[PDB]
């Protein structure tokens, strides 16, 4: 009988009855009660905290012998060749309507431009807008990209690749060491290219964005700028972040895009919009790369624009937490940039360039742009979200907290359970 | 007797005397001594570390369906209408003296401007500087704010609110989704507004600062800029930080401002200066919003400037740690910004704007400013300071460290104490 | 006999044989085996994790009553006085060759400039390039530094110190409170200074870099810029980072530079290059401060440039991890900066400055530069790499994990070992 109380190896209270004294027995019983009470309260609290799925983050800065230079893409803030637009003004509103897929900016209904564009779309059903923008848009050529070098190696227009964005033709670089970097000298040729000011496209200069090669450029007002007549120096540093899965973080690794190119939030949004629009129309706008047939011009007014309006009005596409349609990615790469400027044509260099290009000194100040992109002296930086706890970690805390007061362990718990099993 | 050594549940050494052997008894005594010696040393060390009140910080990045756009405020780098200042030059030095409350920049004594300003203040005692600056300062009007939109919705001058700063009249916006943001097109009208160059106000352009709506703008050289004739794109991302109380961090939540608008370091400085000045003079400079009566002009020279000089000399107002007069706030919101530029009037748009405003092409280049502020694609970032330890955490470590060597617990400590109590 | 099993204070299973029952004995043996099996597996795992030398990083933001303003250095983007270069064009290629030590940019062999420079070097062996660049380079003077102030105190050209960089003469400031800072107004005098455009030096403006006073400026494309005719405002905040030693982090504190000025990565690279070159030639290029004799001009072509080519081609000098020749420093200071601009000469101030300097209005727009550098409202930020574990920490985890299941301690391990020793 007494062996049950005397043999239970938990520190507990062996002398509850073996003390053979009233005061000692009462004290021992009180201790036995209180120790386990505190232990169970603490363990309940600890389990409650665990069920919150806590996390912690860490910051580290690595460096490598050599590193990948992120891809860059460029576009001209004047989107159309002047002659092709001189007698064809409706093109502005046509392109605006077609680009609503990306820029998501509402058009005043029954506006003169909208009315004329609708009339033209009703008339010239077989007209090909995409071919027009490809042929008559911006273009890279010895007459446009005067100079360009990369880590001391010359590069040629053939090295770039074509891309479509709301600004028309856009060109990427490096598509799929400190100090050194990419250097360029554009000739925006402001007299040859033009744009509608009434639509707000008033500024002149080069708009470019930095992105990882796997990505598709975004722009939509997030791209950087560079003015005419000033040499702009841009310094960048790679930044990488990691997120934990939804139970702890917000990523959902299991989702995959129809292109199957891993995953990317903007790609998820594009695919979602393509999927939605395909239901309401048998064709997909070509600005979304390869989801199906390109719609005839009239379909843009007939179905596309109302569909986008409805999508935004009902928030059928969203990003952010796992509850959103396109949750955050497991891994992401950002390239923060800082900028500084210098007057590009110096008086001494101005005449030299004028002789080189057989053009007036006014033209040089009013047309040329020089850009330089370099890695900073500190190469790399990473942010990582840690799993604050797993099953083992909680058990480690459980044992220490349990042993703190009661001076017990799982073996003692098993022994106590064995004693209970006989009584039950 | 022997039950005391045999029954003490602490692992220790039960066989100190029960071993019935010299070597075993000596070994057991040595073990019993050494285990507790190491345990007590470790526990003392750990208590010492705890009394340092350690802390750790974490970084996280959240996102929401929609977010609040921070308030923005603007001012003109030319502060006074040209005609009102043409025959009234003393106004420059008068305003400088009055603004010493904010800009805290010393004035060379007995300077011609200072002498003339003192003479005028002695003469025109009843002159109202504040009314003058309100009436003749900068102003928002269809002639000044040519265009402005907010998330695609047009906005009108009536949407702004008036504010006083060292630059005279200043206007706020949004006072108390990615890509989209605020767009503006100012007409600085450099011919109509003017400023004293001898005082250093040589540059022309728009100066603005970004702050949470609850806050009061600061400027004092911390505001951003935007030049004339260039379209400036500004991208921002909300950053939030939290600090622990003085025993761990530096915050002192218990301090409350007389306006009772929660707390803010700059507000604390303003209130402290108002309190100090009110003692030495029955009136408070109006640039401090609502602490009492506004002082007559002469009082600025009589008391205010010497009082400010004394304040700075004796450091009667300070910020930073809890020892400072205005300690750091518990919660803070900052909006870091990056900037890039483009030439604003394009050759094609230049003529259009000239026709629109019936003004020369030179005027357009020399007067207009265009600004755009957008949220970045990543919305939110927060920094939080964690309590590295509370009472429970130290106890958890205490039990594990104690159990490591001696294999004991609080229950054993109680049992050991009970044995000691009988002997005592 | 039975005392061995009954007396072993480890919770384990005292009743393996004392149970006097088959089922109880089997259960107790199973428990004794399983508890220690799990414990040993967990302890092995934990030792494995420890041997990874884990680390964690923390971020904190402190503030002080006053703080040290970092040193700044400036250079002119036009490097040579126009007259001295008018009839001496070979100087451009000569300086390019000599500066190859720093800019590490390859020269096209047998180029006309290279041929003529080699001819001159063969002819004028005793010509002193360093004296030439010192005398005829950029210079600070009342004719060049029109104005400059520091925290409200006027400063004079005598306060700067001379330095040599690839841009020729360069001047430092502050060499070995919020809002207030450094203000300057340069006169680049674009007519008096000039540079070769064919070498790419086309832009005009001021190039400057921010560094701690102990450091030597780097430039090499990492320096900031500021254009002509625009007032540039620069805001900075001090950032400090701390790294752990190679076993945990990447620092190797034991390495010391020959100058013994503590340590710095760029200093390590400079010293390494000097050491390598000194072997292949008895003289060291003067751009490396004080490592020995300066080489005669011909030696630059004879030995230096081939030696640099070989160094780069064999990566004999490297930075980064401890495996690299110049590992990361233990402590580093960076000064990230953000920039904004305003049109410098306002119409009202333009005439005033023209009268002040007796120069045409065109000159003022085409020659003057204004800069201002200020500390942000948040002073200081530090990043620290923590030792995730020491010997004591692992022992703390070891005891808790051991006590979790087996309910044992080192004392029990000693008792078990004592029992084993007798059997052995």
GROMACS .gro file of C-alpha atoms in nm, chain A residues 73-418:
model
  346
   73UNK     CA    1   1.403   4.691  -6.935
   74UNK     CA    2   1.351   5.028  -7.101
   75UNK     CA    3   1.070   5.220  -7.269
   76UNK     CA    4   1.031   5.561  -7.429
   77UNK     CA    5   0.792   5.808  -7.267
   78UNK     CA    6   0.687   5.905  -7.621
   79UNK     CA    7   0.531   5.590  -7.757
   80UNK     CA    8   0.447   5.648  -8.125
   81UNK     CA    9   0.632   5.758  -8.436
   82UNK     CA   10   0.514   6.108  -8.522
   83UNK     CA   11   0.425   6.052  -8.888
   84UNK     CA   12   0.214   5.740  -8.832
   85UNK     CA   13   0.007   5.931  -8.576
   86UNK     CA   14  -0.016   6.265  -8.758
   87UNK     CA   15  -0.327   6.170  -8.958
   88UNK     CA   16  -0.448   5.888  -8.732
   89UNK     CA   17  -0.528   6.047  -8.395
   90UNK     CA   18  -0.789   5.785  -8.308
   91UNK     CA   19  -0.494   5.555  -8.240
   92UNK     CA   20  -0.437   5.721  -7.902
   93UNK     CA   21  -0.780   5.629  -7.768
   94UNK     CA   22  -0.766   5.288  -7.934
   95UNK     CA   23  -0.441   5.207  -7.754
   96UNK     CA   24  -0.578   5.348  -7.429
   97UNK     CA   25  -0.880   5.118  -7.452
   98UNK     CA   26  -0.667   4.815  -7.535
   99UNK     CA   27  -0.421   4.892  -7.254
  100UNK     CA   28  -0.699   4.922  -6.998
  101UNK     CA   29  -0.614   4.555  -6.938
  102UNK     CA   30  -0.295   4.673  -6.766
  103UNK     CA   31  -0.329   5.037  -6.662
  104UNK     CA   32  -0.681   4.988  -6.520
  105UNK     CA   33  -0.764   5.357  -6.556
  106UNK     CA   34  -1.125   5.443  -6.631
  107UNK     CA   35  -1.228   5.626  -6.948
  108UNK     CA   36  -1.495   5.896  -6.944
  109UNK     CA   37  -1.791   5.750  -7.131
  110UNK     CA   38  -1.924   5.919  -7.445
  111UNK     CA   39  -1.608   6.128  -7.471
  112UNK     CA   40  -1.531   6.258  -7.819
  113UNK     CA   41  -1.225   6.036  -7.840
  114UNK     CA   42  -1.421   5.738  -7.710
  115UNK     CA   43  -1.703   5.804  -7.956
  116UNK     CA   44  -1.468   5.828  -8.253
  117UNK     CA   45  -1.274   5.520  -8.143
  118UNK     CA   46  -1.596   5.321  -8.111
  119UNK     CA   47  -1.699   5.436  -8.458
  120UNK     CA   48  -1.365   5.325  -8.602
  121UNK     CA   49  -1.382   4.990  -8.423
  122UNK     CA   50  -1.728   4.936  -8.569
  123UNK     CA   51  -1.596   5.031  -8.913
  124UNK     CA   52  -1.250   4.873  -8.946
  125UNK     CA   53  -1.320   4.538  -8.782
  126UNK     CA   54  -1.026   4.362  -8.949
  127UNK     CA   55  -0.767   4.624  -8.847
  128UNK     CA   56  -0.479   4.477  -8.645
  129UNK     CA   57  -0.382   4.702  -8.354
  130UNK     CA   58  -0.103   4.473  -8.234
  131UNK     CA   59   0.074   4.475  -8.570
  132UNK     CA   60   0.040   4.853  -8.581
  133UNK     CA   61   0.196   4.906  -8.239
  134UNK     CA   62   0.474   4.660  -8.319
  135UNK     CA   63   0.566   4.828  -8.647
  136UNK     CA   64   0.514   5.195  -8.560
  137UNK     CA   65   0.617   5.193  -8.193
  138UNK     CA   66   0.951   5.262  -8.033
  139UNK     CA   67   1.252   5.076  -8.169
  140UNK     CA   68   1.617   5.018  -8.081
  141UNK     CA   69   1.863   5.102  -8.357
  142UNK     CA   70   2.201   5.263  -8.415
  143UNK     CA   71   1.999   5.583  -8.460
  144UNK     CA   72   1.853   5.542  -8.109
  145UNK     CA   73   2.099   5.353  -7.885
  146UNK     CA   74   2.413   5.554  -7.956
  147UNK     CA   75   2.635   5.375  -7.703
  148UNK     CA   76   2.612   5.095  -7.450
  149UNK     CA   77   2.860   4.888  -7.249
  150UNK     CA   78   2.837   4.617  -6.984
  151UNK     CA   79   3.118   4.549  -6.737
  152UNK     CA   80   3.359   4.699  -6.987
  153UNK     CA   81   3.231   4.491  -7.280
  154UNK     CA   82   3.055   4.667  -7.570
  155UNK     CA   83   2.697   4.562  -7.639
  156UNK     CA   84   2.477   4.603  -7.945
  157UNK     CA   85   2.102   4.648  -8.001
  158UNK     CA   86   2.085   4.281  -8.098
  159UNK     CA   87   2.149   4.194  -7.732
  160UNK     CA   88   1.810   4.330  -7.623
  161UNK     CA   89   1.477   4.149  -7.644
  162UNK     CA   90   1.134   4.283  -7.735
  163UNK     CA   91   0.850   4.317  -7.484
  164UNK     CA   92   0.500   4.466  -7.487
  165UNK     CA   93   0.381   4.704  -7.216
  166UNK     CA   94   0.140   4.994  -7.181
  167UNK     CA   95   0.413   5.220  -7.322
  168UNK     CA   96   0.426   5.018  -7.644
  169UNK     CA   97   0.748   4.849  -7.745
  170UNK     CA   98   0.985   4.787  -7.455
  171UNK     CA   99   1.327   4.627  -7.456
  172UNK     CA  100   1.490   4.410  -7.190
  173UNK     CA  101   1.859   4.351  -7.121
  174UNK     CA  102   2.041   4.047  -6.984
  175UNK     CA  103   1.715   3.854  -7.017
  176UNK     CA  104   1.709   3.479  -6.964
  177UNK     CA  105   3.201   4.259  -5.881
  178UNK     CA  106   3.170   4.604  -5.724
  179UNK     CA  107   3.167   4.940  -5.899
  180UNK     CA  108   3.135   4.809  -6.253
  181UNK     CA  109   2.796   4.793  -6.421
  182UNK     CA  110   2.574   4.883  -6.717
  183UNK     CA  111   2.613   5.208  -6.911
  184UNK     CA  112   2.389   5.349  -7.184
  185UNK     CA  113   2.332   5.660  -7.396
  186UNK     CA  114   1.986   5.684  -7.553
  187UNK     CA  115   1.871   5.924  -7.823
  188UNK     CA  116   1.504   5.979  -7.742
  189UNK     CA  117   1.474   6.174  -8.070
  190UNK     CA  118   1.192   6.387  -7.934
  191UNK     CA  119   1.119   6.524  -8.282
  192UNK     CA  120   1.060   6.179  -8.436
  193UNK     CA  121   0.848   6.028  -8.156
  194UNK     CA  122   0.539   6.195  -8.014
  195UNK     CA  123   0.247   6.138  -7.779
  196UNK     CA  124  -0.089   6.284  -7.684
  197UNK     CA  125  -0.061   6.552  -7.414
  198UNK     CA  126  -0.436   6.570  -7.353
  199UNK     CA  127  -0.409   6.217  -7.213
  200UNK     CA  128  -0.147   6.340  -6.965
  201UNK     CA  129   0.166   6.201  -7.135
  202UNK     CA  130   0.343   6.534  -7.111
  203UNK     CA  131   0.689   6.443  -6.981
  204UNK     CA  132   0.984   6.336  -7.195
  205UNK     CA  133   1.255   6.093  -7.090
  206UNK     CA  134   1.333   5.726  -7.041
  207UNK     CA  135   1.134   5.500  -6.808
  208UNK     CA  136   1.297   5.178  -6.690
  209UNK     CA  137   1.243   4.914  -6.423
  210UNK     CA  138   1.470   4.656  -6.260
  211UNK     CA  139   1.353   4.298  -6.212
  212UNK     CA  140   1.487   3.947  -6.182
  213UNK     CA  141   1.527   3.776  -6.522
  214UNK     CA  142   1.254   3.520  -6.449
  215UNK     CA  143   1.006   3.801  -6.387
  216UNK     CA  144   0.789   4.003  -6.624
  217UNK     CA  145   0.825   4.382  -6.585
  218UNK     CA  146   0.539   4.566  -6.418
  219UNK     CA  147   0.569   4.944  -6.461
  220UNK     CA  148   0.218   5.073  -6.384
  221UNK     CA  149   0.381   5.372  -6.219
  222UNK     CA  150   0.636   5.167  -6.024
  223UNK     CA  151   0.912   5.216  -6.281
  224UNK     CA  152   1.193   5.465  -6.238
  225UNK     CA  153   1.262   5.765  -6.460
  226UNK     CA  154   1.552   5.958  -6.609
  227UNK     CA  155   1.535   6.308  -6.760
  228UNK     CA  156   1.670   6.449  -7.084
  229UNK     CA  157   2.004   6.626  -7.073
  230UNK     CA  158   2.127   6.476  -6.744
  231UNK     CA  159   2.355   6.182  -6.668
  232UNK     CA  160   2.178   5.969  -6.408
  233UNK     CA  161   2.374   5.730  -6.185
  234UNK     CA  162   2.171   5.449  -6.029
  235UNK     CA  163   2.311   5.227  -5.753
  236UNK     CA  164   2.135   4.906  -5.652
  237UNK     CA  165   2.171   4.619  -5.407
  238UNK     CA  166   1.999   4.282  -5.421
  239UNK     CA  167   1.745   4.213  -5.145
  240UNK     CA  168   1.589   3.871  -5.090
  241UNK     CA  169   1.309   3.775  -4.851
  242UNK     CA  170   1.151   3.445  -4.744
  243UNK     CA  171   0.808   3.383  -4.592
  244UNK     CA  172   0.672   3.087  -4.397
  245UNK     CA  173   0.366   2.888  -4.497
  246UNK     CA  174   0.017   3.009  -4.409
  247UNK     CA  175  -0.002   2.828  -4.072
  248UNK     CA  176   0.301   3.034  -3.965
  249UNK     CA  177   0.358   3.291  -4.240
  250UNK     CA  178   0.156   3.373  -4.551
  251UNK     CA  179   0.301   3.169  -4.840
  252UNK     CA  180   0.114   2.881  -5.002
  253UNK     CA  181   0.385   2.694  -5.195
  254UNK     CA  182   0.145   2.439  -5.344
  255UNK     CA  183  -0.012   2.685  -5.591
  256UNK     CA  184   0.129   2.675  -5.944
  257UNK     CA  185   0.073   2.899  -6.245
  258UNK     CA  186  -0.050   2.763  -6.578
  259UNK     CA  187   0.283   2.868  -6.730
  260UNK     CA  188   0.436   2.658  -6.450
  261UNK     CA  189   0.725   2.905  -6.421
  262UNK     CA  190   0.737   2.855  -6.042
  263UNK     CA  191   0.525   3.139  -5.896
  264UNK     CA  192   0.505   3.517  -5.882
  265UNK     CA  193   0.236   3.745  -5.745
  266UNK     CA  194   0.203   3.959  -6.057
  267UNK     CA  195   0.200   3.644  -6.267
  268UNK     CA  196  -0.080   3.512  -6.047
  269UNK     CA  197  -0.280   3.830  -6.104
  270UNK     CA  198  -0.224   3.810  -6.480
  271UNK     CA  199  -0.331   3.445  -6.492
  272UNK     CA  200  -0.639   3.515  -6.279
  273UNK     CA  201  -0.749   3.798  -6.506
  274UNK     CA  202  -0.690   3.583  -6.814
  275UNK     CA  203  -0.896   3.302  -6.665
  276UNK     CA  204  -1.182   3.537  -6.577
  277UNK     CA  205  -1.190   3.710  -6.916
  278UNK     CA  206  -1.172   3.383  -7.110
  279UNK     CA  207  -1.507   3.282  -6.962
  280UNK     CA  208  -1.686   3.594  -7.086
  281UNK     CA  209  -1.509   3.596  -7.423
  282UNK     CA  210  -1.346   3.331  -7.638
  283UNK     CA  211  -1.035   3.546  -7.688
  284UNK     CA  212  -0.773   3.687  -7.451
  285UNK     CA  213  -0.607   4.030  -7.489
  286UNK     CA  214  -0.261   3.985  -7.636
  287UNK     CA  215  -0.096   4.189  -7.360
  288UNK     CA  216  -0.145   3.873  -7.153
  289UNK     CA  217   0.121   3.659  -7.320
  290UNK     CA  218  -0.007   3.315  -7.420
  291UNK     CA  219  -0.349   3.227  -7.273
  292UNK     CA  220  -0.537   3.185  -7.602
  293UNK     CA  221  -0.666   3.368  -7.907
  294UNK     CA  222  -0.633   3.743  -7.941
  295UNK     CA  223  -0.968   3.919  -7.948
  296UNK     CA  224  -1.092   4.120  -8.243
  297UNK     CA  225  -1.080   4.494  -8.185
  298UNK     CA  226  -1.453   4.531  -8.125
  299UNK     CA  227  -1.444   4.273  -7.846
  300UNK     CA  228  -1.236   4.513  -7.638
  301UNK     CA  229  -1.534   4.748  -7.616
  302UNK     CA  230  -1.796   4.474  -7.622
  303UNK     CA  231  -1.676   4.251  -7.337
  304UNK     CA  232  -1.325   4.327  -7.214
  305UNK     CA  233  -1.366   4.672  -7.060
  306UNK     CA  234  -1.698   4.591  -6.887
  307UNK     CA  235  -1.541   4.269  -6.760
  308UNK     CA  236  -1.248   4.458  -6.608
  309UNK     CA  237  -1.487   4.708  -6.452
  310UNK     CA  238  -1.684   4.423  -6.297
  311UNK     CA  239  -1.366   4.250  -6.178
  312UNK     CA  240  -1.249   4.562  -5.995
  313UNK     CA  241  -1.601   4.634  -5.866
  314UNK     CA  242  -1.628   4.285  -5.713
  315UNK     CA  243  -1.262   4.236  -5.614
  316UNK     CA  244  -1.261   3.897  -5.786
  317UNK     CA  245  -0.879   3.918  -5.794
  318UNK     CA  246  -0.674   4.002  -5.486
  319UNK     CA  247  -0.322   3.970  -5.345
  320UNK     CA  248  -0.180   3.945  -4.995
  321UNK     CA  249  -0.272   3.691  -4.729
  322UNK     CA  250  -0.359   3.332  -4.817
  323UNK     CA  251  -0.725   3.435  -4.821
  324UNK     CA  252  -0.646   3.650  -5.126
  325UNK     CA  253  -0.659   3.506  -5.476
  326UNK     CA  254  -0.284   3.557  -5.539
  327UNK     CA  255  -0.100   3.515  -5.208
  328UNK     CA  256   0.254   3.631  -5.145
  329UNK     CA  257   0.537   3.424  -5.290
  330UNK     CA  258   0.760   3.197  -5.083
  331UNK     CA  259   1.069   3.375  -5.217
  332UNK     CA  260   1.102   3.724  -5.362
  333UNK     CA  261   1.383   3.941  -5.498
  334UNK     CA  262   1.375   4.321  -5.481
  335UNK     CA  263   1.631   4.572  -5.612
  336UNK     CA  264   1.604   4.900  -5.421
  337UNK     CA  265   1.779   5.185  -5.601
  338UNK     CA  266   1.917   5.529  -5.520
  339UNK     CA  267   1.976   5.795  -5.783
  340UNK     CA  268   2.196   6.099  -5.840
  341UNK     CA  269   2.241   6.322  -6.143
  342UNK     CA  270   2.487   6.534  -6.340
  343UNK     CA  271   2.444   6.773  -6.631
  344UNK     CA  272   2.512   6.543  -6.925
  345UNK     CA  273   2.650   6.757  -7.210
  346UNK     CA  274   2.945   6.956  -7.080
  347UNK     CA  275   3.046   7.262  -7.279
  348UNK     CA  276   3.363   7.086  -7.391
  349UNK     CA  277   3.178   6.763  -7.472
  350UNK     CA  278   2.879   6.940  -7.627
  351UNK     CA  279   3.065   7.051  -7.940
  352UNK     CA  280   3.234   6.711  -7.970
  353UNK     CA  281   2.901   6.529  -7.966
  354UNK     CA  282   2.751   6.783  -8.206
  355UNK     CA  283   3.029   6.713  -8.455
  356UNK     CA  284   2.993   6.339  -8.399
  357UNK     CA  285   2.619   6.337  -8.474
  358UNK     CA  286   2.608   6.629  -8.722
  359UNK     CA  287   2.327   6.784  -8.517
  360UNK     CA  288   2.267   7.122  -8.359
  361UNK     CA  289   2.375   7.196  -8.003
  362UNK     CA  290   2.011   7.258  -7.905
  363UNK     CA  291   1.921   6.908  -8.026
  364UNK     CA  292   2.188   6.752  -7.805
  365UNK     CA  293   2.053   6.917  -7.491
  366UNK     CA  294   1.692   6.843  -7.587
  367UNK     CA  295   1.724   6.479  -7.697
  368UNK     CA  296   2.002   6.276  -7.529
  369UNK     CA  297   1.985   6.067  -7.211
  370UNK     CA  298   2.269   5.888  -7.031
  371UNK     CA  299   2.214   5.618  -6.768
  372UNK     CA  300   2.447   5.408  -6.555
  373UNK     CA  301   2.353   5.121  -6.323
  374UNK     CA  302   2.609   4.976  -6.081
  375UNK     CA  303   2.612   4.734  -5.790
  376UNK     CA  304   2.690   4.888  -5.453
  377UNK     CA  305   3.003   4.798  -5.261
  378UNK     CA  306   2.795   4.569  -5.036
  379UNK     CA  307   2.663   4.300  -5.266
  380UNK     CA  308   2.385   4.098  -5.107
  381UNK     CA  309   2.131   4.104  -4.825
  382UNK     CA  310   1.871   3.845  -4.724
  383UNK     CA  311   1.571   3.843  -4.490
  384UNK     CA  312   1.449   3.508  -4.359
  385UNK     CA  313   1.146   3.414  -4.150
  386UNK     CA  314   1.230   3.146  -3.895
  387UNK     CA  315   1.004   2.879  -3.752
  388UNK     CA  316   0.995   2.994  -3.391
  389UNK     CA  317   0.904   2.642  -3.277
  390UNK     CA  318   0.853   2.284  -3.389
  391UNK     CA  319   0.727   1.981  -3.198
  392UNK     CA  320   1.068   1.916  -3.043
  393UNK     CA  321   1.114   2.272  -2.918
  394UNK     CA  322   0.784   2.271  -2.728
  395UNK     CA  323   0.875   1.938  -2.568
  396UNK     CA  324   1.206   2.089  -2.458
  397UNK     CA  325   1.023   2.376  -2.286
  398UNK     CA  326   0.764   2.136  -2.144
  399UNK     CA  327   1.023   1.918  -1.972
  400UNK     CA  328   1.213   2.207  -1.816
  401UNK     CA  329   0.898   2.381  -1.694
  402UNK     CA  330   0.761   2.053  -1.557
  403UNK     CA  331   1.089   1.974  -1.382
  404UNK     CA  332   1.117   2.325  -1.239
  405UNK     CA  333   0.861   2.284  -0.959
  406UNK     CA  334   0.744   1.922  -0.945
  407UNK     CA  335   1.089   1.786  -1.033
  408UNK     CA  336   0.924   1.527  -1.255
  409UNK     CA  337   0.958   1.384  -1.604
  410UNK     CA  338   0.767   1.180  -1.859
  411UNK     CA  339   0.893   0.862  -1.692
  412UNK     CA  340   0.735   0.979  -1.367
  413UNK     CA  341   0.419   1.067  -1.558
  414UNK     CA  342   0.416   0.712  -1.694
  415UNK     CA  343   0.468   0.575  -1.342
  416UNK     CA  344   0.184   0.791  -1.212
  417UNK     CA  345  -0.035   0.674  -1.500
  418UNK     CA  346   0.055   0.312  -1.423
   0.00000   0.00000   0.00000
